[PDB]
């Protein structure tokens, strides 16, 4: 047995809100992400066949976890679908949460990494036109270049797009732990993946973004 249908249904709808909001925020992030790993695919045969736009040593280094980032969230998301119109017959939800925090080590590598990937992205796109094009055309939303004494954005900014949403990500689980009983193991779960979760960001707060305002002087 379980609750009344009446009952569950309170907790179906606002659980399906949450759950949805993620699988909402990423379907339409996947979809612009996988326009980056397009492209890339061709490149890695490329770094063995004629002579590529660059080598492989400068693409390997920025496209680190590019599609493997893709595919570590589509997976999450896509299980995700079926899940909300099939809540288990007798289980809770947390694996699939447990799995992002159990790869979190990756996310560090790139980190560690953030300042050489500019550092050969930059010089890439004034050494070549087809790293140059893909730089301007950079899909973005509207920015504050147009008219302000400053300058267009760097591959630093693109990649720091999503690193910016995944830090926001971390605020799911503690709001869901919130709504979550404390009596029910279900609680600690979500508050041990949210314990790393922000830990980790946490721990590289100066290094994306040092100060609230820090631009570049003559």
Not at 83 to 88: A, F, K, T
Not at 108 to 135: L, P, T, W
Not at 151 to 164: A, H, Q
Request: glycine share 2%; aromatic share 8%; net charge neutral.
């Amino acid at each position: 047995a379980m609750a009344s249908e009446l009952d569950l249904e309170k907790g179906l709808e606002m659980r399906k809100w949450v759950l949805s909001g993620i699988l909402a925020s990423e379907e339409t992030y996947l979809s612009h992400l996988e326009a980056l790993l397009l492209p890339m695919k061709p490149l890695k045969a490329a770094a063995t066949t004629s002579q590529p736009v660059l080598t492989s040593q400068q693409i390997e280094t920025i496209f680190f976890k590019v599609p493997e980032l893709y595919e570590i969230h589509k997976e999450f998301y896509d299980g995700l679908f079926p899940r909300v119109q099939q809540w288990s017959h007798q289980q809770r939800v947390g694996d699939l949460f447990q799995k992002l925090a159990s790869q979190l080590g990756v996310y560090r590598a790139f980190v560690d990494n953030y300042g050489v990937a500019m550092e050969m992205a930059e010089k890439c796109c004034q050494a070549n036109a087809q790293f140059a094009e893909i730089s301007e055309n950079l899909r973005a939303r509207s920015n504050k270049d147009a008219k302000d004494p400053t300058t267009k954005n760097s591959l630093e900014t693109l990649l720091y797009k999503p690193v910016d949403r995944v830090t926001r990500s971390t605020l799911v689980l503690h709001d869901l732990l919130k709504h979550t009983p404390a009596s029910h193991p279900d609680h600690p779960l979500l508050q041990d993946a949210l314990r790393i979760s922000q830990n980790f960001l946490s721990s590289i707060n100066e290094e994306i973004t040092p100060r609230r305002q820090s631009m570049t002087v003559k």
